[PDB]
RNA sequence: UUCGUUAAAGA
RNA sequence: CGCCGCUAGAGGUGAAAUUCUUGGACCGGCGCAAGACGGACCAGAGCGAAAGCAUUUGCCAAGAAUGUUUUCAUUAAUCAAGAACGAAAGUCGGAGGUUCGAAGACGAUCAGAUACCGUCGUAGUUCCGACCAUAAACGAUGCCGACCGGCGAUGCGGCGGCGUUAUUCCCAUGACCCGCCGGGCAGCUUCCGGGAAACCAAAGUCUUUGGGUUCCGGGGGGAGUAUGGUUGCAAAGCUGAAAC
């Protein structure tokens, strides 16, 4: 049963700090919560650890990921262009 | 490519229903040991350990090695199952001929 | 004051085997204090029409020049591109035409490295009713990656002296118009531009082998 | 080093005079650009992350890609105790009292 | 008198309403 | 002085770029390596009314004496630029260039070959007049 | 007052496919004789796919849209 | 009521048309819409082309030809003399020679 | 380059 | 912006001034940085459901059309509710800020400008994420199916033609020419018929009135307003009457 209708995560706060502050804090406060896929050992076990660190369930291989992410868009841009210099004319 | 990587999933589709196959690490050990598998196949992000030893194998055993550019959950999907594999053995081919065009 | 009574006069030699060995004459400001008078003289560039180093060419498909050093009031000078007229460049575009255009790097023998262009025009074939002469664009990317190949396997393995006696007669254009006719009938293919962007090393002695 | 990597590479936790082992953009989600190599007189420019174009040596080194943790500054902080904990955390940077009152 | 500023003035007669309203509801 | 020449019977050159606007018209005598200006008259330089300074009178008057300096300075022949405001105004020349290159040819300066150097946009950055533009 | 009980041969070849009253379809069987020992095979003229001789192992229809060009020329013949 | 049935532009099978700025009022007009003609003007007037011939260096091998591609609106293309008006028998005519 | 207004009716 | 050269003015307008300059303005030559932009080629041409889409190359999936002696076998057309996109402007975060530029400040013309003209410039115009769902969103013209004139062209496939032109020479496509087929954007004429006419091969097949289906109008204002319901951060969007 759908109990909340717009604060969704954010109820917890309640009628405390504003709406815009609380929407702007719901997206991220799930990003920070959802479980990501683990892109070594298959599964779904991306449990946030403190920030900037990713830890998943199984196979125990932490990775060093975004703040309230585990990638963050101007990270896959960053990796793009590291592997783009890479292999542009061989240095 | 895509006629190659459309090519595999056809392959594995005519595998699922009509040829015989192993499912898993545990279970392809006993086939690359008793020699019963020809062609075994490993996802693209199984580990290096693993990898390696079944690449081992297969080069002591004359088993073709086939790679799968993709996650073993694409993997599960291309053979079908809702799960996730990262090794197969395909031991018998009912009417495909990945024994035939890749080796 | 009168600073051009003060002002120095230099002559300009142009380098090897185009037909002659004269460009113009400069204006030097001196060799006074500290501000040596061969400062200046390295970096001031030309742009020259033909006519008056081809030994009677056409009037455009001008040349780029840098004077390197000066020796013996000689201000010496070399390659640094090639252009064509304005007039040349916004002629020959037909409102219904297919205008085709190419660009590519490429490394010579030595050290420079240059990027040089390339432009095509369809041709209305004798005896044509159709008014329009365009193409399906298939030829027109068959096209691009074809005059990108050619200039390649010209300028990768011959360097200064061989490419800019190449493009005395216009060699490539008509190698592109020998290999253009088998997918379009296209219609004065040229340069239209071709500049160098990477530069070893001064090299006097080269300069030196650059002249005989 | 800087002298080996291409230009527009981005890298971080990179060095002011080499052999300091990291000194330049080393907070959470920066990164350094690197420009304008030099052959003769060695020297290379970088894009800190407050915007300014440093010359530094071509020796100097820094480990290519950017500071993990980025995106810190996205959520509001949303109330006193969060900042507190941080604060008592960081150091005591807090009688933040206005100077009028 | 255009319709559109016509519309645009009754827009903003609307929006002075509309903040009387929840001024003194 | 003479100059650089004794003993005529081979050009001196000089590039000639005239930028030619609507509202003033630059005539300016430079080597053929582009720094060392030579002369340079405006047409405000000889005409007083700034509204009359973009005529062909002030044209003939600034390529008089710019004509006049240049023979004093000693070189003959003149290789010529032609510009305009070209980079988002109007590609069309102005009203004293065609004035202008007679009043070269005229009091000597034996002119080579004409280029109409303009700067040419490619693809028509943002323009002045705005959605409606100008209005009277 | 056209005759469209009985028309013309020529504009009812030179009319479409379906629009026409009979709706005979514009293709045909052909016999490809391979000069490689005797086969004769006989083959649709709009050939989708590849055509491989079961001696020789060659191409004889290369796939083409509209109809399938051929390989040297082969002879064929119209059996209709 | 409909004065033309092309309703001034070309537009019939896209919907939108890049609006190209015009040449003396600078506004933006959809380009099959702008009267877009092209001047080939002899960079010199006849009136000076034998003065020039005549106190040149070359023996009269050298023409230049300036192309423009004037561009104007048909807000100030009538006021400019172009594109004058014409009758309801006349608008379906072509180009003048 | 700019130049404002003239109602009700009266065929 | 940094070097080099020359010199008294250089933008700007119908006209001048506000602006910058002997501290070197403007103009030329070289180099650097920034972001926006893809002309000419560009057409009563193409694609997309529309809004819209134009530098090269690679990758990703998608689709019309065509040729189908291919396959399934009525699986179909329109659609209350509901749902996906939806120009520009506007709103909420993040990076920058070239040009233009709402508001704003001036310089002018007029009796009066706070406007049209000029100078500077904020939000915005750019990109990545979210919202809003409006336009002269136009062909002021619902979708599907058939019929009723001709002609000359164009784009895309298919077919035929000891014609011409390119490779080295049969050989296969390339380029042009002639004709046909299908569907597409279009054009000229017509007493085919309609309509009040403009005009329309559809706005025809309608008093000789009926192929199927959806949405909407009932004199002009009030008024797309008030009041309710609902969506939205808000601007506002959807539904939307009465008195007179
Ligand atoms: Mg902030
Ligand atoms: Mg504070
Ligand atoms: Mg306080
Ligand atoms: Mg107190
Ligand atoms: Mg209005
Ligand atoms: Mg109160
Ligand atoms: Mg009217
Ligand atoms: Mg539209
Ligand atoms: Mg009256
Ligand atoms: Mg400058
Ligand atoms: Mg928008
Ligand atoms: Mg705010
Ligand atoms: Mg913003
Ligand atoms: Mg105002
Ligand atoms: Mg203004
Ligand atoms: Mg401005
Ligand atoms: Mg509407
Ligand atoms: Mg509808
Ligand atoms: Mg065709
Ligand atoms: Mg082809
Ligand atoms: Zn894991
Ligand atoms: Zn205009």
């Not at chain 4, 990597?5 to 959470?28: F, Q, W």
Request: aromatic share 6%.
């Amino acid at each position: 049963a759908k109990r909340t209708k717009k604060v969704g995560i954010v109820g917890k706060y309640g009628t405390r700090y504003g709406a815009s502050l609380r929407k702007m804090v719901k997206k991220i406060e799930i990003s920070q919560h959802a479980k990501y896929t683990c892109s070594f050992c298959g599964k779904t076990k991306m449990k946030r650890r403190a920030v900037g660190i990713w830890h998943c369930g199984s196979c125990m291989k932490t990775v060093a990921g975004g703040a309230w992410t585990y990638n963050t868009t101007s990270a896959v841009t960053v990796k793009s262009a590291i592997r783009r210099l890479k292999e542009l004319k061989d240095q | 490519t895509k006629k190659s990587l459309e090519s595999i999933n056809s392959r594995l589709q005519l595998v699922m229903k009509s040829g015989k196959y192993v499912l898993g690490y545990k279970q392809t050990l006993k086939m690359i040991r008793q020699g019963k598998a020809k062609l075994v196949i490993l996802a693209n992000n199984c580990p290096a350990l693993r990898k390696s030893e079944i690449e081992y194998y297969a080069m002591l055993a004359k088993t073709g090695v086939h790679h799968y550019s993709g996650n073993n959950i694409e993997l599960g999907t291309a053979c079908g199952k809702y799960y996730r594999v990262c090794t197969l053995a395909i031991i018998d081919p009912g009417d495909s001929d990945i024994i035939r065009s890749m080796p | 004051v009168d600073p051009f009574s003060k002002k120095d006069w230099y002559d300009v030699k142009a380098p090897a085997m185009f037909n002659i060995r004269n460009i113009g004459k400069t204006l030097v400001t001196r060799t006074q204090g500290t501000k040596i008078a061969s400062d200046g003289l390295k970096g001031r560039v030309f742009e020259v029409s033909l006519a008056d180093l081809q030994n009677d060419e056409v009037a455009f498909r001008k040349f780029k020049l840098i004077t390197e050093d000066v020796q013996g009031k000689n201000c010496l000078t070399n390659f640094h591109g090639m252009d064509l007229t304005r007039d040349k460049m916004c002629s020959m575009v037909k409102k219904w035409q297919t205008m085709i255009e190419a660009h590519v790097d490429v490394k010579t023998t030595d050290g420079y490295l240059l990027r040089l262009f390339c432009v095509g025009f369809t041709k209305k074939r004798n005896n044509q009713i159709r008014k329009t002469s365009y193409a399906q664009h298939q030829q027109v990317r068959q096209i691009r990656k074809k005059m990108m190949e050619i200039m390649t396997r010209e300028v990768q393995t011959n360097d200064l002296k061989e490419v800019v006696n190449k493009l005395i007669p216009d060699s490539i254009g008509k190698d592109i118009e020998k290999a253009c006719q088998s997918i379009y009938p296209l219609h004065d293919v040229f340069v239209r531009k071709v500049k160098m962007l990477k530069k070893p090393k001064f090299e006097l002695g080269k300069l030196m082998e650059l002249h005989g | 080093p800087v002298g080996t990597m291409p230009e527009g590479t981005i890298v971080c936790c990179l060095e002011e005079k080499p052999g300091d082992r990291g000194k330049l953009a080393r907070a959470s989600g920066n990164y350094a650009t690197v420009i304008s190599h030099n052959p003769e007189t060695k020297k290379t420019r970088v894009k800190l992350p407050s915007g300014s174009k440093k010359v530094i040596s071509s020796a100097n080194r820094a480990v290519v890609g950017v500071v993990a943790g980025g995106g810190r500054i996205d959520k509001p902080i949303l109330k006193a105790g969060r900042a507190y904990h941080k604060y008592k955390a960081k150091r005591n940077c807090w009688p933040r009292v206005r100077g009028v009152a | 008198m255009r319709a559109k500023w016509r519309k645009k003035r009754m827009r903003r007669l609307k929006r002075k309403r509309r903040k009387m309203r929840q001024r003194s509801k | 002085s003479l100059g650089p020449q004794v003993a005529e019977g081979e050009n001196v050159f000089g590039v000639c770029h005239i930028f030619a606007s609507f509202n003033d018209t630059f005539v300016h005598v430079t080597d053929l390596s582009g720094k060392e200006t030579i002369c340079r008259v405006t047409g405000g330089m000889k005409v007083k009314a700034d509204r009359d300074e973009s005529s062909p009178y002030a044209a003939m008057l600034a390529a008089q004496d710019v004509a006049q300096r240049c023979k004093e300075l000693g070189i003959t022949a003149l290789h010529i630029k032609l510009r305009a405001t070209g980079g988002n105004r109007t590609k069309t020349p102005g009203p004293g260039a065609q004035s202008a290159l007679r009043a070269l040819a005229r009091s000597g300066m034996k002119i080579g070959r004409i280029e109409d150097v303009t700067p040419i946009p490619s693809d028509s950055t943002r323009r002045k007049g705005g959605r409606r533009g100008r209005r009277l | 007052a056209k005759d469209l009980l009985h028309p013309s041969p020529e504009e009812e070849k030179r009319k479409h496919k379906k629009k026409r009253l009979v709706q005979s379809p514009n293709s045909y069987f052909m016999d490809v004789k391979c000069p490689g020992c005797y086969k004769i095979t006989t083959v649709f003229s709009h050939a989708q796919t590849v055509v491989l001789c079961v001696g020789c192992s060659t191409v004889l229809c290369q796939p083409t849209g509209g109809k399938a060009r051929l390989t040297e020329g082969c002879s064929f013949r119209r059996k209709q | 009521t409909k004065k033309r049935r092309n309703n001034g532009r070309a537009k019939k099978g896209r919907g939108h048309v890049q609006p190209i700025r015009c040449t003396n009022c600078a506004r933006c007009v959809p380009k099959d819409k702008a009267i877009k003609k092209f001047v080939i003007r002899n960079i010199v007037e006849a009136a000076a082309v034998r003065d020039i011939s005549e106190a040149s260096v070359f023996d009269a091998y050298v023409l230049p030809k300036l192309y423009v591609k004037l561009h104007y609106c048909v807000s100030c293309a009538i006021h400019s003399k172009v594109v004058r008006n014409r009758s309801r028998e006349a608008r379906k005519d072509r180009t003048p020679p």
